[PDB]
């Protein structure tokens, strides 16, 4: 029937609606104390504009962005050289974690793109309150792994990525990917298959010879 998505299952919570993306937890399942402490929501990008609910039982978060911005679909659409370009600038964003208490969750479901393929995150869990609500590199890692494939590569869906790696018809450069120690070394994994695909793609403007 109604199966709950990778998001929902991290969070433990309900998407009740994705126009406009609402997220709504039980308050009795959080860490949170103070309501106060998810005001730093209000604060993540000024892109996406995001409304915060807490009564005596939940919490609701009501998220809109920018009726232009692309979803990660669409960008799964363009070119492999472009969505190359996108998976490097969302690594870019999650090297290193927030001084603010925010805390990232990656996957397809969670993003979307502006105008100049960055991304941007739906939902951000907060420190002690909100989940995600620790830090956690090994998972943020391998979520990251598997977006960016599922971006790039794009041969299976996110779950089956992240889940199911080992078991899989594995590529070069993913198993390059799924090898790396840490967000840096993803990243020097990209920046060479980025270089190697921009090659490919300039030679179809030269006509040898
Ligand atoms: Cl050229
Ligand atoms: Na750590």
């Known amino acids: ?42 604060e993540v990008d000024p892109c ?24 990660f679909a669409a960008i799964r659409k363009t070119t492999l050289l472009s969505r190359i370009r996108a998976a490097i600038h969302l690594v870019s964003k999650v090297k290193h974690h927030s001084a603010r208490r925010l805390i990232f969750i990656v996957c397809p479901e969670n993003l979307m793109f502006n105008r100049a393929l960055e991304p941007f995150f739906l939902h951000v869990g907060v420190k002690e ?39 899989l018809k594995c590529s070069p450069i993913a198993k390059e990917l799924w090898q790396a120690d840490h967000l840096d070394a993803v990243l020097a994994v990209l920046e060479k298959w980025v270089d190697e695909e921009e090659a490919k793609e300039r030679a179809k403007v030269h006509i040898p010879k």
Do not use: C
């Open 129 to 167: 309150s909100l989940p995600p609500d620790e830090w956690d590199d090994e998972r943020l890692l391998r979520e990251v792994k598997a977006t960016v494939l599922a971006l790039t590569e794009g041969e299976y869906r996110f779950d089956e990525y992240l889940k199911f790696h080992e078991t």
């Open 48 to 71: 996406i504009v995001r409304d915060i609910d807490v009564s005596e039982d939940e919490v609701k978060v009501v998220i809109k962005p920018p009726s232009s911005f692309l979803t």
């Open 1 to 42: 029937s109604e199966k709950k998505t990778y998001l929902e299952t991290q969070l433990d919570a309900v998407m009740i609606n994705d126009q406009p993306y609402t997220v709504i937890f039980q308050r009795a399942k959080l860490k949170m104390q103070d309501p106060l402490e998810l005001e730093v929501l209000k």
